[PDB]
DNA sequence: CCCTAACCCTAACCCTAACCCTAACCCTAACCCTAACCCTAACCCTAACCCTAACCCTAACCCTAACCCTAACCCTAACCCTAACCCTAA
DNA sequence: TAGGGTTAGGGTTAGGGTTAGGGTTAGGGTTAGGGTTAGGGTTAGGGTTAGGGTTAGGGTTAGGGTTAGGGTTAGGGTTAGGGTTAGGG
């Protein structure tokens, strides 16, 4: 069983992300809030990809199903896939 | 003469768009001038995008088209930003537009 | 030896001028697989899908951080707070 | 194996026509292909919606012209309309 | 008719004809319109139940757009399913914020000279 | 004189089935008709997209079931799926 | 016609929206935003009417333009 | 005779409990026709379209006022400012 | 002082200039399906005008919702050394 | 397996959170003064429908010419050392 994977996003990673996004000062609970938001978004995206893979009569999620789920959610992605 | 590219004065394929429209089941009857119009619009859009990418590459002292140059040309043009608003480009980048308050003062 | 609130702009410019990835690969893959195991087990990933999901999450986090920084600047505060991310998530429409 | 579309040769020809001293990569080619596919899908959807709203069965150049005028803002819309009308007149005269 | 065989009330042939005329696919099945009619029937039943509950809570025996708007904004699932949906002559929720309140009296009537 | 769809008799029958002591107005009927039309259009679009993605020409109940599972959240999706499967079994057992 | 939106109208709109205090330039900013939105909607409706080979804008074209912009409207029309 | 900042809640509740229209009809029609005359002249309106546009503008203004009030409450200010509507228009995505 | 943007040696590093063969792209020959035009009648949109009665425009007021130095203080990130857990090909 | 991107103890200093008073642009009620709301006259285009003679998109059918998958090495760009130039505490 896989556990302790939610704490994989280290503090320097979020610090570099905030520095790239233009944030010059970070508090304390911002890391936990961003972790929860990313977890919720990943859960929704993975659920959509699982539904698409089950509709396609497959098991391994491919890049085409990921692009389809991203287009259904409302955020297109170019470059990856086709 | 034999192809539509030598008759319409374009380079994008018209029969491919016509076959895609016929196979996509978008309408009962797909015209013949409508695919030519779509090919011309796509050709103009591709020419404008390639011109912007070449200008960005020349400004960045590069002779090739990288996703960074495309992202810069998209975010710089106001019309391209409105046409492609919620479009995420992988390995593109962001603009380093620092705010007026975020300064050493 | 430098003063605080001055060397952050250099790191910001260095991270903005680069288009490399900041999040790792093995922990992200482990978290994605652990989340996918909750719905249906015996699931595989062709790496490219995980990279696409990581890029999408990175873009979403960058946009959220930009919105939070803009809201904090408008609120006369260089730092951010959980109430700022709450206001961002409330105004943006996402829940 | 199979066969894919891959809009690459036409994009390379257009690039060599506007700038023969520059090139393109595989990632940029894929991005351009995805953008062209998305634009074509949006145009097809707009044309289908216009045909279903006008209670018609055929599709003419007027429907795609209106779809371009609605999707594109202003200057780009007028330029695309002018180029399309010029191409249509050139194809009709010859 | 299919209503006496499938145990529903929504028309199936109408949805089938609409799907065949809309040019959505080359071949439209026969069980798929029944599934769509069942889903639409369940959704309509839930919406009508919510509207009736709102009308009974508002001491009314009819369905008005205000009751529908209230039932839509009250249910969390209906709010997520119909997010950016504007209903004409519907209304809004009078959920006053915690800060927008008359608050407590400071110095009696805010007067330091008394 | 033309002819319009106007989904009103079926909605009135469903309302009388769930609550025969209440009624409906013309504005509420139009709102319900617009909502039903929008739901049907979304389902048709999702089914067409799934058929174009799966490289198929026909449409079965699985496509609409997946479209409902994707559009509807959770509890409503499961309830609609159960009701649809029950209706399908009832229509198959009774020719 | 731009000054047709009177001050009491915006005051009642803000009171209905939950605003308990209004400044000064808020009226002018809301007027400009409404003017821009009306201009865009009218342009879309004019394009739709020109595509439909008509002149008078009907409710169906308005509903189509509202659905294209991304904000559906129920009740009015069909 | 009442004190300020107390009778506003009564008017807010009275305006929220009612579903009537606040914007007039003739000035709105005149403004719509004046805006439509800039693109193409000789245009007519079947009243119902103007009412639908007025309802849509009312809903948009209500949503914008709600967002501005929420942002002002978060910013520790009961009143609103043009910078608040600018932040609202910037975060919502509609232009800028 | 402590980094910071700017010019010349090479070593990997990633696209570009011809090729080739396989599904895919245009013409010709006959045809009906649904595109815009005028002949056409009445129902909806519009302009100057009586009314008379709720509210929008100006006029004096005084007080509390607003803001600029005082002066006491406790919260957050400038080094830097230690340690452990990410990052690299087979 | 190996090595460099994470992890932690030290510390003092600079930025959110509380204090005290003034003055101006915002509330709140009153009364003299247009512009909005229906109420009610015909009409000058504007949109809907049926019948008759036309012309470009959808029905097989062979035949070609060009777009998709390999071979190799060559030519734009990443990385590897310093030396000279400049932003700041």
Short mmCIF file of C-alpha atoms in Angstrom, two decimals, chain E residues 6-99:
data_model
loop_
_atom_site.label_atom_id
_atom_site.label_comp_id
_atom_site.label_asym_id
_atom_site.label_seq_id
_atom_site.Cartn_x
_atom_site.Cartn_y
_atom_site.Cartn_z
CA UNK E 6 -40.13 0.57 -20.43
CA UNK E 7 -42.20 1.89 -17.52
CA UNK E 8 -41.51 5.57 -18.21
CA UNK E 9 -43.44 8.64 -19.38
CA UNK E 10 -40.95 10.61 -21.50
CA UNK E 11 -41.09 9.95 -25.26
CA UNK E 12 -38.33 7.82 -26.75
CA UNK E 13 -39.13 8.16 -30.44
CA UNK E 14 -38.91 11.95 -30.17
CA UNK E 15 -35.38 11.78 -28.75
CA UNK E 16 -34.45 9.20 -31.39
CA UNK E 17 -35.74 11.42 -34.20
CA UNK E 18 -33.95 14.44 -32.72
CA UNK E 19 -30.69 12.48 -32.54
CA UNK E 20 -31.12 11.25 -36.12
CA UNK E 21 -31.86 14.76 -37.42
CA UNK E 22 -29.11 16.46 -35.41
CA UNK E 23 -26.43 14.56 -37.38
CA UNK E 24 -24.56 13.63 -34.20
CA UNK E 25 -23.53 10.14 -35.36
CA UNK E 26 -23.98 7.76 -38.27
CA UNK E 27 -26.04 5.20 -36.31
CA UNK E 28 -28.10 6.04 -33.21
CA UNK E 29 -29.03 3.04 -31.10
CA UNK E 30 -32.36 2.05 -29.60
CA UNK E 31 -31.41 1.54 -25.95
CA UNK E 32 -29.44 4.78 -25.79
CA UNK E 33 -32.57 6.95 -26.27
CA UNK E 34 -34.30 4.89 -23.57
CA UNK E 35 -31.37 5.55 -21.22
CA UNK E 36 -31.46 9.26 -22.04
CA UNK E 37 -35.22 9.38 -21.48
CA UNK E 38 -34.81 7.64 -18.11
CA UNK E 39 -32.08 10.09 -17.07
CA UNK E 40 -34.22 13.05 -18.15
CA UNK E 41 -37.21 11.60 -16.29
CA UNK E 42 -35.19 11.20 -13.08
CA UNK E 43 -33.80 14.73 -13.40
CA UNK E 44 -37.26 16.19 -14.02
CA UNK E 45 -38.67 14.25 -11.06
CA UNK E 46 -35.93 15.54 -8.76
CA UNK E 47 -36.38 19.12 -9.98
CA UNK E 48 -40.16 18.91 -9.54
CA UNK E 49 -39.73 17.46 -6.05
CA UNK E 50 -37.42 20.32 -5.09
CA UNK E 51 -39.83 22.87 -6.58
CA UNK E 52 -42.76 21.35 -4.69
CA UNK E 53 -40.79 21.39 -1.45
CA UNK E 54 -39.87 25.05 -2.00
CA UNK E 55 -43.49 25.92 -2.79
CA UNK E 56 -44.71 24.13 0.34
CA UNK E 57 -42.09 25.93 2.43
CA UNK E 58 -43.10 29.28 0.88
CA UNK E 59 -46.83 28.60 1.52
CA UNK E 60 -47.67 28.35 -2.18
CA UNK E 61 -49.45 25.74 -4.29
CA UNK E 62 -47.82 26.67 -7.62
CA UNK E 63 -44.36 26.59 -9.18
CA UNK E 64 -42.91 30.06 -9.77
CA UNK E 65 -39.41 30.93 -11.09
CA UNK E 66 -38.53 32.16 -7.59
CA UNK E 67 -39.12 28.69 -6.13
CA UNK E 68 -37.03 27.10 -8.89
CA UNK E 69 -34.18 29.56 -8.30
CA UNK E 70 -34.33 28.91 -4.55
CA UNK E 71 -34.30 25.13 -5.05
CA UNK E 72 -31.38 25.43 -7.48
CA UNK E 73 -29.29 27.68 -5.22
CA UNK E 74 -30.08 25.64 -2.10
CA UNK E 75 -28.94 22.25 -3.42
CA UNK E 76 -25.16 21.91 -3.70
CA UNK E 77 -25.42 19.29 -6.46
CA UNK E 78 -27.85 21.40 -8.51
CA UNK E 79 -25.58 24.43 -8.08
CA UNK E 80 -22.60 22.48 -9.45
CA UNK E 81 -24.62 20.99 -12.32
CA UNK E 82 -26.11 24.39 -13.24
CA UNK E 83 -23.36 26.84 -12.35
CA UNK E 84 -23.40 29.66 -14.91
CA UNK E 85 -27.16 29.51 -15.47
CA UNK E 86 -29.16 32.75 -15.30
CA UNK E 87 -32.90 32.38 -14.65
CA UNK E 88 -35.09 35.32 -15.63
CA UNK E 89 -37.33 36.65 -12.84
CA UNK E 90 -35.69 34.25 -10.41
CA UNK E 91 -34.01 36.15 -7.58
CA UNK E 92 -30.99 35.98 -5.31
CA UNK E 93 -30.26 34.63 -1.84
CA UNK E 94 -30.38 37.09 1.09
CA UNK E 95 -27.25 35.67 2.75
CA UNK E 96 -25.85 38.70 4.57
CA UNK E 97 -22.17 38.56 5.47
CA UNK E 98 -20.92 38.50 9.06
CA UNK E 99 -19.22 41.89 8.66
#
